[PDB]
Amino acid sequence: MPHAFKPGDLVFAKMKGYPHWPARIDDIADGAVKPPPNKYPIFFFGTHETAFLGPKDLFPYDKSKDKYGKPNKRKGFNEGLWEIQNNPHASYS
Ligand SMILES: CC(=O)N(C)c1cccnc1
């Protein structure tokens, strides 16, 4: 059975106006801004932007890749696919 989400988990993350997007649950660095309660720090592959989202917007990568892991016109999307598939745990500083 599923656990709760944890840092390092790989997902497709959905925001209003954008396709399901390759992403990871980030850690919070010591001394860094924490998210609101009930929200996770989401790092989006390709764009390298962060947002705070709840589970309703988070689709586990393994289960969803066949639906969602297809090239897309949007800026950074295809880079994002390479990253989630090829080095999803790296520093994208
Ligand atoms: C892919 C991407 O970067 N998206 C969807 C985003 C992330 C954070 C804020 N707005 C949009």
Domain count, the chain: 1
Q: How far apart are CA 15 and CA 4, in angstroms?
A: 20
**d(CA 23, ligand 1 centre) in Å:** 10
Ligand 1 center to 24 CA (angstroms)? 12
Looking at this protein, which amino acid is placed at residue 26? Answer: D
Q: What is the CATH number of the domain that holds 60?
A: 2.30.30.140
Residue 58 maps to a domain = yes
Strand order in the sheet with 21-25: 50-53, 40-44, 21-25, 10-13, 58-60
Q: Evaluate whether residue 13 is within a structural domain.
A: no
Three-state SS for 8-75 is CCEEEECCCCCCCEEEEECCCCCCCCCCCCCCEEEEECCCCCEEEECHHHEEEHHHHHHHHCCCCCCC
Q: What is the distance, to the nearest Å, from the Cα of residue 62 to the centroid of all Cα atoms in its chain?
A: 13
Domain for residue 51, yes or no?
Answer: yes
DSSP H or E run through 3: none
Identify whether 49 is part of a domain: yes
- CA 18 – CA 89 distance, rounded (Å): 23
- 92: in domain: no
For ligand 1, mutation pick of 12, 49, 74 (most atoms within 8 Å of CB): 49
